[PDB]
Amino acid sequence: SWQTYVDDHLMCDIDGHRLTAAAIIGHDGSVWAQSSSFPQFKSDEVAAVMKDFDEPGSLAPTGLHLGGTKYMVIQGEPGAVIRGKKGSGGITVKRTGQALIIGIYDEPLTPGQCNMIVERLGDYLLDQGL
Ligand code: NA
């Protein structure tokens, strides 16, 4: 299930190019499911994420390092979304009521495109019980 909710949604052929590494995680790090090529985040990298969600910004200063790489926060619904970017590619963290969707991308996949996707599911699960 999670591995379809990810490999059939979180990693589709928009326009003509898949994403890079999707992953759905709990508000605690518990890795519900994730792409084969998703990066070993860190229970903390995650805790920070949660930190900013309650109080926007706080992450942004130091940036978001996770899956190893650091990202430059950008713009997102304070308490609901968070976007990060590193050159061509970047990341997005859709926060559900119990989980957090996540997408990683690199050229030629526009940040826009990523959004569309991570944010897509997020809507769903939210209004479905999570
Ligand atoms: Na949407």
From Swiss-Prot:
InterPro entries for this protein: PFN, PFN_euk, PFN_sf, Profilin_CS
This protein's UniProt keywords: Actin-binding, Allergen, Cytoplasm, Cytoskeleton
GO molecular function, one term: actin monomer binding
Keyword Ribonucleoprotein: no
Keyword flag Repeat: no
A GO term from the CC aspect: cytoskeleton
Listed SUPFAM superfamilies: Profilin (actin-binding protein)
Stretches assigned to coiled coil: none
Subunit structure: Occurs in many kinds of cells as a complex with monomeric actin in a 1:1 ratio.
Family affiliation: Belongs to the profilin family.
Name this polypeptide is given: Profilin-6
Native species: Hevea brasiliensis (Para rubber tree)
